[PDB]
């Protein structure tokens, strides 16, 4: 269940951070998993 911005479509439900794959790639440059290979 999306507890951030009501965005259930594509939750990343792993580890309870629970961001949708749209907004996960919005906030991808705040955590640190970025493009290496």
């Amino acid at each position: 269940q999306c507890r951030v911005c009501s965005s259930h479509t594509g939750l990343i439900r792993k580890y309870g951070l629970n961001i949708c794959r749209q907004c996960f790639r919005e906030k991808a440059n705040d955590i640190g998993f970025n493009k290496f290979r």
Partner: protein
Amino acid sequence: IIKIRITLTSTKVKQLENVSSNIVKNAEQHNLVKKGPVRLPTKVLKISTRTWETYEMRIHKRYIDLEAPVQIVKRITQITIE
């Protein structure tokens, strides 16, 4: 005389080596007995993201043993905050 182990972790190698080398220089310039910077394996935390792609993260770890009184340990722990 307290024996304290400092376990340092970082994502980038240059600042972590700088912090470790500053610990070595300052604990060497006033005669503290110590173990050298033990360099743990860099753990590679990865996520397979939707063919498929891979997101990576390198995490580097050192630890340094020190034997020092309370004043020197507190001043070292306060100043080395970066």
